Design a protein around this ligand. Structure first.
Ligand SMILES: C[C@](O)(CO)[C@H](O)COP(=O)(O)OP(=O)(O)OC[C@H]1O[C@@H](n2ccc(N)nc2=O)[C@H](O)[C@@H]1O
Ligand SMILES: Nc1ncnc2c1ncn2[C@@H]1O[C@H](COP(=O)(O)OP(=O)(O)NP(=O)(O)O)[C@@H](O)[C@H]1O
Ligand SMILES: [Cl-]
Length: 283
């Protein structure tokens, strides 16, 4: 039997850079919300202990793909405690709708969905806590996706606190440029002294993304996408870009702006949700 699992995108509703660690990593205060939109992952169990990703993801080698790294990591960890049945394996395929990076966390979501799905299908019985712990080694966004709830993140992104921000409708655009996360974080003009604040304060303050000024300055087309969207609604960068989102109260307004917007915005409309579609589908 084949099973299908959601792999939703996320948005950083806000993102503040508070400083830099001894190793150059940046400490942050950020808010995650899921989009009811993303990739779909299909799994068929194997009994020969093999992991086979049947669908190539543009420019990513089999062993480099987060789907495969997640599956192997779970296999190894579960086997360490004797919680992996002999012969456990899987054929995996993905319907990839999300862009590469862009600040939507697509790869991290793929990894999280795989961890949760295989844990379930192989009957390993690991807790979401255990999955999120191993998931962190694959990236700070992974635990958020694994845990399934909108969350405020601190430290370098590893310290999570579940929260319940307003759920809005979003128009998410992407001009086509692939911005590598490290390119933004290494920029000399990037703000790195935003004061650390309490969750209560951050939730009542205007939402913004500290990376946006840099993204706009260095990528003309990101600046243009922002210019166009700001004509219609509050809009900002998510993650380190290049994706930008515009906020709306209803689906109808969002979709009407999408029809009006330049086609090169490559936009899609999706509802923000505080419970991940992955966990929702498991109810
Ligand atoms: C900023 C976010 O996109 C918010 O959703 C994520 O927290 C990014 O975290 P991540 O994807 O786990 O980090 P990666 O994309 O693996 O890191 C790529 C590189 O970005 C830089 N980096 C990333 C995260 C961080 N808090 N400070 C940094 O200076 C580091 O040089 C790092 O080596
Ligand atoms: N299954 C996958 N889907 C998408 N990207 C993958 C996958 N596996 C590996 N990647 C790599 O992840 C890179 C994106 O870097 P980014 O860091 O991670 P992300 O979670 O996909 N997106 P972002 O929200 O911008 O952090 C891509 O350029 C790919 O090379
Ligand atoms: Cl949680």
């Amino acid at each position: 039997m084949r099973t299908q699992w959601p792999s939703p995108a996320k948005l950083n509703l806000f993102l503040y850079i508070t400083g830099q660690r001894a190793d150059g990593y940046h400490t942050l205060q950020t808010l995650f919300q899921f989009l009811d939109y993303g990739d779909t992952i299909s799994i068929e169990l194997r009994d020969d202990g093999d992991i086979r990703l049947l669908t190539p993801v543009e420019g990513v080698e089999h062993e480099d793909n987060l789907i495969v790294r997640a599956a192997r990591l779970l296999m190894k960890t579960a086997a360490d405690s004797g919680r992996l049945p002999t012969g456990s394996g899987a054929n995996i395929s993905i319907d990839k709708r999300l862009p590469m990076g862009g600040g939507l966390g697509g790869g991290s979501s793929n990894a999280a969905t795989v961890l949760v799905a295989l844990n379930h299908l192989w009957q390993c019985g690991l807790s979401m806590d255990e999955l999120a712990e191993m998931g962190l080694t694959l990236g700070a966004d992974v635990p958020v996706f694994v845990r399934g709830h909108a969350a405020f993140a601190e430290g370098v992104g590893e310290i999570l606190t579940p929260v319940d921000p307003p759920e809005k409708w979003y128009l998410v655009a992407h001009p086509g440029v692939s911005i590598p996360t490290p390119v933004i974080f290494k920029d000399p003009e990037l703000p790195r002294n935003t004061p650390k604040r309490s969750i209560e304060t951050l939730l009542k303050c205007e939402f913004s993304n500290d990376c946006e000024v840099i993204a706009r300055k260095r990528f003309r087309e990101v600046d243009a996408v922002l210019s166009w969207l700001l004509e219609y609604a509050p809009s900002r960068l998510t993650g380190t870009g290049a994706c930008v989102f515009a906020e709306f109260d209803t689906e109808s307004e969002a979709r009407q702006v999408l029809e009006q917007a330049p086609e090169w915005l490559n936009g899609f409309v999706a509802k923000g949700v505080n419970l991940s579609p992955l966990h929702r589908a498991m109810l």
